[PDB]
Design a protein around this ligand. Structure first.
Ligand code: CL
Ligand code: MG
Ligand code: MG
Ligand code: MG
Length: 294
């Protein structure tokens, strides 16, 4: 459980914007994708567990981490489709080959599940945790935060997030069981220090969650990857959490029906990487060991 980032940041130009990523080691990729409101930093205590098992890659989504901000920015910016445009292009640029192990969290799971559906022959295994595995209803959403996420989706969201930064300053530490040090919180705050559109990714993301049918485009995307994952023979590792947040109740029951799946449970709420990184890392390394027998 340490505060230092993992690896060296590297940069690739995508569509006029510089995108930042970690790419350590050699071999077939193990591709770790963060969601909201995090960055490659989320995985810093987990990626070392896979040392020597492949290329250890963690990309910063556009507008997040050390990847450039989009300008102009406004309520239309940083939707799922736009993130997928940038991330598809970066993943193409990284020359990943056809034995990718995906390790995904939160919106990283919506992006990674959809990429895997579209590139299924190229995916050797999928490890996922606190994921958006299917469209949901509000009743599925954690009770502790249902009102706040409704408010992000409303016109309240601009003040709450762009002015007050509540997703970074309150949702993120409130969905970690242990207290963060100032350096850890600073690494999460860093991309979003500035009021206004610098914080737009952390407001656009809750507006994309497929809940009660809207927004319809993301609902259709998640419908598609849910139906595909539930019948896919690709090896899976489900990293369950207690108490958990998002992958609980009926969604957790759904994920437990997926084929070719192993499971572990760790302590954590939503950003479980900060509570149990070594247990998560050890499960992923064992999974990759099995998929890549030495
Ligand atoms: Cl979100
Ligand atoms: Mg080094
Ligand atoms: Mg530039
Ligand atoms: Mg007021």
């Amino acid at each position: 459980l340490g505060a230092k980032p993992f690896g060296e940041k590297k940069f690739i130009e995508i569509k006029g914007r510089r995108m930042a990523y970690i790419d350590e080691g050699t071999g077939d990729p193990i591709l770790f994708q963060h969601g909201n409101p995090t960055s490659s930093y989320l995985w810093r205590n987990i990626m070392p567990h896979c040392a020597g098992l492949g290329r250890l890659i963690a990309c910063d989504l556009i507008g997040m981490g050390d990847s450039d901000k989009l300008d102009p920015s406004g309520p239309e910016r940083y939707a799922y489709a736009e993130h997928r445009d940038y991330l598809d292009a970066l993943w193409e640029a990284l020359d990943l080959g056809d034995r990718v192990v995906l390790v995904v969290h939160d919106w990283g799971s919506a992006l990674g599940f959809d990429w895997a559906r579209r590139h299924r022959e190229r995916v050797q295994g999928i490890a996922y945790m606190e994921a958006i595995a299917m469209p949901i209803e509000w009743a599925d959403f954690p009770e502790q935060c249902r009102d706040l996420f409704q408010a992000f989706r409303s016109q309240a969201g601009e003040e709450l997030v762009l002015q007050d930064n509540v997703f970074v300053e309150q949702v993120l530490p409130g969905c970690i069981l242990r207290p963060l040090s100032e350096a850890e919180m600073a690494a999460y705050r860093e991309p979003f220090l500035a009021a206004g559109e610098a914080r737009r990714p952390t407001l656009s993301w809750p507006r994309q969650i497929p809940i009660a049918g809207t927004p319809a485009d993301v609902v259709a995307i998640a419908r598609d990857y849910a139906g595909w994952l539930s019948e896919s023979p690709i090896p899976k590792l489900f990293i369950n959490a207690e108490p958990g947040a998002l992958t609980t109740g009926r969604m957790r029951d759904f994920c437990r029906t997926w084929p070719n799946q192993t499971e572990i449970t760790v302590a954590g709420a939503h950003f479980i990487q900060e509570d149990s990184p070594d247990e998560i890392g050890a499960a992923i390394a064992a999974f990759v060991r099995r998929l890549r027998p030495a």
